[PDB]
Write a protein that binds this ligand. Structure first.
Ligand SMILES: [Mg+2]
Lengths: 285, 286
């Protein structure tokens, strides 16, 4: 542990990471594209450099917190000859394939790449209850783990550099879709004269019940089996239709439940009326 | 403990009549197809030939029918015989359908309790089972004891539409969130990961959602969407990465593309710096 690191990206996330590194006695060199002054970090000892060239020269270990992978290419391609021997830990959220391609591009330039998917907002940096998904070369990960674990606990998922972004993105698919379904349901409730406070225990109970369904179906899904022994797709379809009609009667936007309804209807069209609604995964595949 | 009529002898109606018989009720039954009642008759149910006889038997009439249309079909021709009856409608439908049925029944001198049964027929007779009820509170309280032989009750208020409202808005979450789980699982499968591998992470995300609902509840009730903990523009970018992840994995795009278009509509109406909760305005409008 050299206790020396560069942080490229000084939005809220990058700043919280630099702050914790300073607290633990690291030398911290910082840079970003808009030349933020970072006055509070500097007063705590951060070294603000002018260019990305200087930022990369400062340290072997470079933590990136950027908008996405395209930014990484923009800023690094012009300094591609300066990457030899560097370890880049990219904490930027993007796709699994972007992470894989970046890892190879860096390796071709003599650098090593670790992918991280931070699961917490900036306020969770420095807390051991916080987790980040990691993936990439295991020897490179173990060499820098101690530093990474000053920021959060680690969940190392495997050697494939895309895996940390895979686990991150599939959880966000659930997050955003389920939360928008709550807001849609709430809009219906509000049109009918009930408040969010009134809905709260029922929205919460339904959400908290979902893992039991996931636990039930998991082993069936892994066998590719959709028998209609506890539920049938045709009955599910009828249930969805009532949600759609309830939506329309309330004057609420139909797009979200109508998309749910179209998925069900495609499963019916391809012969699954008597199978479990889990058969709809075949539509998604 | 006393006496009740069950009209409609599908699986739900049969399970309810059965539990009433077990608890010592005198049970009168009718169905358009007479023979559906044979097992119940052997157990002591009184089958009657006509709807008139079934209505005459008791004050309390459970309508375990397949649709509200069936109610109109069988009761309209006998509309003069409904004074003093209390009809408990268990068909799943919209809040407005329950309201229109209640008013129709009141115009003929009857009263209407809406029920939203949350369990399959196998859950009838179990106290862990709940049914949502709504309609006149005095009518509901007069019959609560009998209704609670079937399941525990959750009375939601005087509007007959409320029992259906609470049921349908919970199903909006159920189906949309469970499809998003299947969708996410399909992406994971395309990258070599199993449902067993995804399980604790899917579970953990789902279990975290009530904490977000609790956080945003009081803000939503104030109509406040400040961007102090989250900004819509950042949400949009996050959704765009989910869409890309999906396309790269060769998985069907329709579900996350719909989410993305909601976010884009909020952006294009001037909400870049507000909380994503501001998207309730998009749902409200349209
Ligand atoms: Mg930057």
């Amino acid at each position: 542990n050299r206790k020396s690191v560069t942080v490229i990206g000084l939005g809220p996330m990058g700043q919280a990471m630099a702050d914790v590194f300073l607290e633990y006695g690291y030398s911290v060199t910082v840079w970003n594209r808009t030349s933020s002054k970072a006055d509070q970090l500097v007063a705590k000892g951060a070294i603000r450099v002018s260019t990305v060239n200087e930022a990369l020269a400062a340290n072997e270990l470079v933590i990136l917190s950027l908008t996405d992978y395209n930014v990484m290419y923009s800023i690094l391609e012009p300094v591609s000859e300066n990457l030899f021997g560097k370890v880049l830990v990219n904490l930027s959220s993007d796709t699994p394939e972007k992470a894989r391609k970046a890892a190879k591009w860096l390796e071709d330039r003599g650098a090593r790449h670790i992918t991280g998917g931070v699961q917490v907002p900036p306020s969770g940096i420095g807390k051991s209850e916080s987790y980040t998904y990691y993936s990439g070369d295991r020897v490179v990960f173990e060499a820098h783990r101690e530093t990474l674990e000053v920021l959060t606990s680690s969940d190392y998922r495997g050697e494939d550099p895309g895996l940390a972004m895979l686990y991150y993105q599939i959880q966000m698919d659930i997050f955003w879709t389920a939360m928008l379904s709550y807001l849609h349901a709430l809009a219906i409730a509000n049109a009918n004269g009930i408040t969010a406070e009134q809905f709260l225990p029922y929205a919460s109970a339904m959400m908290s019940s979902l893992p039991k369904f996931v636990e039930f179906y998991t082993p069936r899904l892994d066998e590719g089996e959709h028998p209609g022994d506890v539920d049938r797709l045709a009955m599910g379809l009828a249930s969805v239709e009532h949600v759609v009609h309830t939506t329309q009667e309330a004057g609420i936007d139909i797009a979200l439940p109508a998309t749910v309804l179209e998925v069900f209807r495609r499963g019916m069209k391809t012969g699954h009326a008597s199978d479990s609604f889990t058969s709809l995964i075949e539509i998604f595949k």
